[PDB]
Design an enzyme around this catalytic site. Structure first.
Site, PDB file in Angstrom:
ATOM      1  N   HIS A 106       7.270  51.883  38.083  1.00  0.00           N
ATOM      2  CA  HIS A 106       8.517  51.906  38.996  1.00  0.00           C
ATOM      3  C   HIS A 106       9.788  52.477  39.155  1.00  0.00           C
ATOM      4  O   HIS A 106      10.620  51.757  39.798  1.00  0.00           O
ATOM      5  CB  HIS A 106       8.485  49.885  38.410  1.00  0.00           C
ATOM      6  CG  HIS A 106       9.363  50.257  36.759  1.00  0.00           C
ATOM      7  ND1 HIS A 106       8.860  50.096  35.619  1.00  0.00           N
ATOM      8  CD2 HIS A 106      11.101  50.385  37.306  1.00  0.00           C
ATOM      9  CE1 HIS A 106       9.506  50.210  34.636  1.00  0.00           C
ATOM     10  NE2 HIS A 106      11.008  50.359  34.987  1.00  0.00           N
ATOM     11  N   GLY A 160      17.918  51.107  32.449  1.00  0.00           N
ATOM     12  CA  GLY A 160      18.108  52.397  32.496  1.00  0.00           C
ATOM     13  C   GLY A 160      16.840  53.143  31.718  1.00  0.00           C
ATOM     14  O   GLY A 160      16.838  54.046  31.080  1.00  0.00           O
ATOM     15  N   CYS A 208      13.570  52.517  30.305  1.00  0.00           N
ATOM     16  CA  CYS A 208      12.353  52.788  31.345  1.00  0.00           C
ATOM     17  C   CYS A 208      12.291  54.430  30.736  1.00  0.00           C
ATOM     18  O   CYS A 208      13.281  54.966  31.801  1.00  0.00           O
ATOM     19  CB  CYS A 208      12.544  51.757  31.992  1.00  0.00           C
ATOM     20  SG  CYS A 208      12.429  49.998  31.117  1.00  0.00           S
TER      21      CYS A 208
HETATM   22  C1  Q6U Z   1      13.338  49.742  33.273  1.00  0.00           C
HETATM   23  C2  Q6U Z   1      14.193  49.736  33.527  1.00  0.00           C
HETATM   24  O1  Q6U Z   1      15.011  50.569  32.890  1.00  0.00           O
HETATM   25  N1  Q6U Z   1      14.652  48.802  34.610  1.00  0.00           N
HETATM   26  C3  Q6U Z   1      16.107  49.457  34.892  1.00  0.00           C
HETATM   27  C4  Q6U Z   1      15.765  49.912  36.631  1.00  0.00           C
HETATM   28  N2  Q6U Z   1      15.162  48.053  36.949  1.00  0.00           N
HETATM   29  C5  Q6U Z   1      14.815  47.915  38.351  1.00  0.00           C
HETATM   30  C6  Q6U Z   1      13.970  48.957  38.964  1.00  0.00           C
HETATM   31  C7  Q6U Z   1      13.280  49.570  39.602  1.00  0.00           C
HETATM   32  C8  Q6U Z   1      13.913  47.877  36.238  1.00  0.00           C
HETATM   33  C9  Q6U Z   1      14.775  47.568  34.695  1.00  0.00           C
END
Ligand code: Q6U
Ligand code: Q6U
Lengths: 304, 304
Positions: free
Chosen positions: B41, B143, B145
């Site tokens: 993602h 952030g 992820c």
């Molecule tokens: C998973 C994470 O850290 N996120 C930050 C970014 N968001 C939008 C996208 C792509 C998702 C959650």
């Protein structure tokens, strides 16, 4: 979201751990620049610990008696000196992995990460608080002495603790990196009274703010209190008295959540008087005091 | 003595963390050998997350669109491929700090350390369990992820988790390092049911053994039980049913303490039916299930 008892990344400290052996005693040392720091009781046998004369024991030791090993390589000792309860072994090689560092003496109620080590090798990392009575409730077995406590601000490691002993009560005592014990403790195998411990009130309120930020709000009530009224309750439950300095440090959390510090004190007051009634806050069934207001801000903002 | 929720030393993993940016999205990546692993993602905008077509979104991307930075130096991307929910970015440089590693898919109830990261930089480390419902109760902000979960056996890092998302309920979901989600979760911003969670019974008994070893014994009683009788209580309190495999894994702790596993089950049974009565076990006011029997043995023996 979510809130965990998080320790600092231990990488910078792992690169400093060494094994120090003197006679039949092996402890951990901290190698920074060309100096290895370790508890002075590395020169004692188990028998000597009952009533050691460190000055007399150290006189029987030469540089070649201190075996210092960093991983698989041996360090050459070219000097030794005792500073309070720590030994400083001058080595001929500067640690290539020496991070930016400082030696700091923390205050009671402040938190830090501990890298538990055995034979100069890291076993694990955990976050803890320096108790108001200057003990720490760690996880340390024989051989862990010399393991250190620290905090990190971007690239600088502030070393605040070195492990020296377990009191007969099962709690832990140690020194700053200048070898000064935190508390009234001596590096001697004798019964030693730790003071009456108290709960770190400012940390509990900081954790209550972390709970509100992360969704746990059941404990919020319609009440307020005064510093004087709250402190009468704090005294009864063996909590540290809250000062305006503590209220000021909670300012950012109070501003972020919109809950006045004295309103959070009234929530804490009702929790002290009524208990949790079988409920939990941030996965805990008691009031947690191992998160400072700075820890809550850092974890809630993702400071790297 | 003493018992703490201890994480593995994070040094070996810190040396693998990188920042991955694609368009306006920045996540963390894991650099092992000449491959950078990150959540797929990273190619989505916040809008795309509602219903992403990853195959179609990835086709609009070339190697030069994936900006990979390790500390202050930029990595050159020479290949990209999607494997399940992870992207594998082939880089032209092998990570000099690549530890000995394995990719492993852990079982529910097993524990691991998480190195929470933002922008490729480590913020902290904590120990957690993979819930029986395949969620984790972490501490992760936007952030984070791409942050990973792992275990270490001497010099080998077994990577078991990569963080991908927070469910609307505030719990966390992610994948193994092959990009396969743990649980029924999809990398889409939609309401997703996590199963009914249960308490990891074998871990609670392991922690009860850790309590006995470390001095907390008040909960030991004069009773015993059977696996069948205990499991009727376990079902009522939403505990995982105990099997002979779990009893066998508890064997070493039962042998060390001299307390038969079914006698410890009878203690657990009375604690479930009566509660703690305002008392604590290893500084906790609830029954802790984030320590496996292997964790208790390791921490109680000082494995480095
Ligand atoms: C998973 C994470 O850290 N996120 C930050 C970014 N968001 C939008 C996208 C792509 C998702 C959650
Ligand atoms: C502090 C520590 O790790 N210990 C192991 C060695 N004991 C005997 C000596 C010297 C003291 C405790």
């Amino acid at each position: 979201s979510g809130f965990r008892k998080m320790a600092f990344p231990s990488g910078k400290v792992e690169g400093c751990m060494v094994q120090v052996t003197c006679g039949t005693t092996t402890l951990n040392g901290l190698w920074l620049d060309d100096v290895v720091y370790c508890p002075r009781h590395v020169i004692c046998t188990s028998e000597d610990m009952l009533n050691p004369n460190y000055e007399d024991l150290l006189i029987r030791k030469s540089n070649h008696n201190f075996l210092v090993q960093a991983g698989n390589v041996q360090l050459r000792v070219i000097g030794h000196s005792m500073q309070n309860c720590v030994l400083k072994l001058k080595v001929d090689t500067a640690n290539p992995k020496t991070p930016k560092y400082k030696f700091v003496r923390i205050q009671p109620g402040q938190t830090f990460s501990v890298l538990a080590c055995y034979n100069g090798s890291p076993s694990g990392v955990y976050q803890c608080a320096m108790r108001p009575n200057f003990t720490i409730k760690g996880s340390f077995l024989n051989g862990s002495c010399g393991s250190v406590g620290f905090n990190i601000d971007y690239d600088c490691v502030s070393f605040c603790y070195m492990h020296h002993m377990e009191l007969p009560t099962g709690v832990h005592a140690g020194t700053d990196l200048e070898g000064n014990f935190y508390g009234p403790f001596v590096d001697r195998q004798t019964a030693q009274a730790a003071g009456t411990d108290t709960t770190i009130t400012v940390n509990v309120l900081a954790w209550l703010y972390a709970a509100v930020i992360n969704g746990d709000r059941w404990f919020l009530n319609r009440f307020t209190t005064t510093l004087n009224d709250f402190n009468l309750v704090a005294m009864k439950y063996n909590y540290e008295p809250l000062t305006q300095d503590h209220v000021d440090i909670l300012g950012p959390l109070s501003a972020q959540t919109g809950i006045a510090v004295l309103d959070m004190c009234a929530s804490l007051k009702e929790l002290l008087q009524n208990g949790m009634n079988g409920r939990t806050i941030l996965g805990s069934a008691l009031l947690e005091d191992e998160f400072t207001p700075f820890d809550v801000v850092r974890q809630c903002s993702g400071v790297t």
